[PDB]
Amino acid sequence: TNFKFSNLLGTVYCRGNLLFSPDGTHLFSPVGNRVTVFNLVENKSYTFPFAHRKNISRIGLTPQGNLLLSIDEDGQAILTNVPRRVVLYHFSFKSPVTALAFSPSGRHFVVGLKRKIEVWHVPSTPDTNEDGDLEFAPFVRHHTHMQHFDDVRHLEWSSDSRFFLSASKDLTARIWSLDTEEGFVPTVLSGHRQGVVGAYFSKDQETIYTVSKDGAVFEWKYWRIVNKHFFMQNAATLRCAAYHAESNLLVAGFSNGIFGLYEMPDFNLIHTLSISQNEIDFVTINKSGEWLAFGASKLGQLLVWEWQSESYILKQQGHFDAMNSLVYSPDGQRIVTAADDGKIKVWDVESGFCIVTFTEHTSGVTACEFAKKGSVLFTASLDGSVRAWDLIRYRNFRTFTAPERLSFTCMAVDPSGEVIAAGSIDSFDIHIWSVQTGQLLDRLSGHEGPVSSLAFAPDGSVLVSGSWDRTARIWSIFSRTQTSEPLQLQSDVLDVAFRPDSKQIAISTLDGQLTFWSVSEAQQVSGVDGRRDVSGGRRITDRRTAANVAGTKNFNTIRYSMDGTCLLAGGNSKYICLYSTTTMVLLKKFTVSVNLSLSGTQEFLNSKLMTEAGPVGLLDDQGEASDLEDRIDRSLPGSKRGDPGARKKFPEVRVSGVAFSPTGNSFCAASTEGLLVYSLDNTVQFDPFDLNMEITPASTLAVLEKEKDYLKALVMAFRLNEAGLITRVYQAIPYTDIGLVVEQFPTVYVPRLLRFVAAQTEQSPHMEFCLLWIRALIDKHGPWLAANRGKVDVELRVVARAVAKMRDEIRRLADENVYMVDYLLNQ
C-alpha cells in the first residue's frame, strides 16, 4: 500500500573505495548508486537513504565515525549522518574526484581532483553546534594548489594531522602542510618507474614509504632515499597498497588477483595469496590492523581477511550478469535469485550476505522456484536442465532434462511438489516430469508458439500455460481427463500470475496490457491497459523518442500480493507498477533507478551530450586506457544475451523479476543495479484506525496507570496504531490478565495483534509472555481463524514463523542438555 525503500540487496560491491568504521565492526561498501553498511561482528546490513546520480567514486569518514562523504563521478558530493541514517549536505566538486582523505583530527579533508589538491574545512553539523541548523554553503575551503603535473591517485594524512602527502599518477609523491612551518619547504619525492599508487607515513614521521605501480616500494629518509626495494612478480602490476603504521605492515593487491602482505621496517614477506582471477581494485585496512579488506571491481568480490589467523572472515560476491528470477522461501527470511552468470545463489534478507551459491548449471539460469515446503529449490536453465536442489543438505536430488536437447526458459512446480512443468523456446510443447519417480510424465500439446510463462495453481489442480500463440491455456491434468481450455488473447503472452486463492489469474501480454480471468468458469473479469504507466524512456541508441519506444511498454513479470489485492507488474523499463484487483486503479509506481551510468533512466535525455559524432557516452574510448586487458576488446559482434566478451558500458534499466514477500510489508525487484527490497514504512507515518478526540497517549497511559482497564487500554493503543504505546501497554498488562483480555477482546483487531505478537516473539526477549499471548489468542479465537483461513492466512503464518524459530532454535539445546545431563548423571 505504502512502500518505501528498504535495503538494496544482492550486490556486495561495485566500483569504489570501501572503508571500515573506526570500531572495526562495520564495513562501508559502495554499491552502484548507494552505500551499504553491514554490521560484521553481529551480521546485520542496511543501505543508506540517499542515491547518487552516477556510480560511487569514493567514500570518506570522520574519525569520530559519524559523518560520511560520498562522491559520485564528476565530483558529485554528499555527506550524510551515519548514526541517525539521514542525508545532510549536498555538494559538487567540479572536477572528477580521484583521491579523498579525511583528516585524523576530524577537522579538514584533502580532496585530490584531476590535478588539483584542495583542502577543505569539514562542515560543522547540527549534531555539533548547540542551537544550530543546516547552513547554506557549509563547505569552506582552506587551500587549493595545482602545482602537480598529472592525476593524483592517493592521499594520506599524518597521524597528528599537520602534514599530508600525495601519491601521483605522473611519477612522484609530494609532502605538504596545512599552515606554514618554519623549517619546512613543500617538496617532491622523486622518480619511480611508472607512478605511485601510495605514499604512506610511519608512526615516527621521518621515513616516508612510497609504493609505485611497477612493483617497487621505496623508503626515503631525510631528503634522499635510504633504500629502494622492489619485489618480483611475473605478469602483473601493482594496483593497490595499504599501510598500517602502528603495526608497520603493507598490503599490496595486484592485477592477477593476488595480494602480498609485508611487515615493513625492513622488507619482509609475511604472507601472500590469490583471491580472484581479476585485478584487485581497492585495499582498506582496519584501525586495529587485524582485518584487511579487498575489493575486486570486475566481479563482485568483496572480501575481509584476518592476516595472522589466515582466514576469510568475509568472501562475498554479487552477480556479474543479469538476473532472471527471484523467489522467497515460504518462511520469508531468504530470497533466492538466479542469473546469466550460471550460478543460483541464496541470499539472507537480514545480514546482507549470500548464504549459498550453487554452481552446477552452466550457461545462464532462467527460472527459480520453491514448493509449498521451502525445503526444495526447483530451478531451470538454458543448459537444458531443471535441477531440483535439496536445500537442507545443499545438494540436488534430481536433474531432469528433455529427451531431445532443449534449453528451458520457464518452470513451474506443483505445490505438493511431485509434478514438474517446464517449457522452452526451441520446442513449443510443455514437458512434465515426476519428482517421486524421476522420469518424464508427459509432454503436452496445444500451443502454436514457444510457451513463455508457466504457473501451477496454489491449490494444485490447474496448470496454466501462456504462449506466443497469443493464447493462454488451462491444463486440467490431475483428474482422469487431462483436458485443456484455451484463452484466446490479443498478443504474445509475457506473464501469468495466480491469485493466492486459486479463483482468479492475471496475464501480462505484449501490448502492455494486463487482464484478469476467472479460473473456475473461464471468463475475463477485468483488465488494465498499462502501456503509458510503464514507459521508462530513451535508452541511448534510441533515435526514437522516449514515449514512442515500443519495447519499454510491456510487463515482463507480474505477481499478486499475499492478500490478493495489489499486483506488482514490471518490464524492461524504469517503473515498477503496483495495481489493484477490485477497483483496477494504479495504486503506486516506483522509479527503480536514479542512476546515470545506467541507460534507461532519463526520459528526455539532454542535448548537451550529443556531440557532432553522436552521444558522447557512445564513443568507444577503450583505447584511452593504460592497461592491456582494459584496452583489449575481446567481445563478439552482435550478442544480446550472455557473452563472456561484454564491453558492458551503460547497461539498461530492467526489472528482471519482482516478487512479494510472504510475510507482509515487503517487496522485491530483481533489477540490473542490484536486488531492491521495498518495505511498507511504518515508523514515521502516523495512521490511526477508528480514532476519537479524547484518545491521546496521555489517555492510554492514563487508563494504564490510574484506573487499570487493560482491554480498553489495549484497544485504545491499537486504535492509535503507535508502536511505542502498544509496546508500553503490551509490556504493561500481566500474564494473569492475558486470558481475561483475549477472553473478552474484539474480533476485528485480532490479526493486527497476531502480527504484533509474532514480531514481539521473534524480536523481544519475552518468550513465555508472548507464547502465553499466542496461546490465549488461538485458544479463544480458534473457530474464527479456522473458519476464515484465507483472510488471516498471512497472520497465521507470521505466527507459525515465530513459534518455529523458537521451537527449533532453543529446544534442540534444551533436549540435548537434559539428555546429556541425564547421561552424565547416569555415569
Partner: protein
C-alpha cells in the same frame, strides 16, 4: 535492401522473439529466423495492413 532493413532496425521497428532489437549486427540463428517480425505499435505494420486493406484500429 540491406540498407532499408538496417535503417529500419536502427529506428527500431523490428523485434527478434519478444525484444525490440536495435543492433544491426545481431546474429540470427536458424530457429530465430522464424520469430522475427515488426514491433507492436509499428507504422510500418500499419502500412502493411493498410496496403492489404485490412487494418483495425483496435
Amino acid at each position: 535492401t540491406v540498407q532499408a532493413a538496417t535503417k529500419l532496425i536502427e529506428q527500431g521497428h523490428v523485434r527478434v522473439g519478444v525484444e525490440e532489437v536495435r543492433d544491426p549486427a545481431f546474429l540470427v540463428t536458424r530457429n530465430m529466423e522464424d520469430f522475427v517480425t515488426w514491433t507492436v505499435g509499428s507504422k510500418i505494420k500499419q502500412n502493411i495492413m493498410k496496403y492489404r486493406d485490412k487494418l483495425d484500429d483496435f
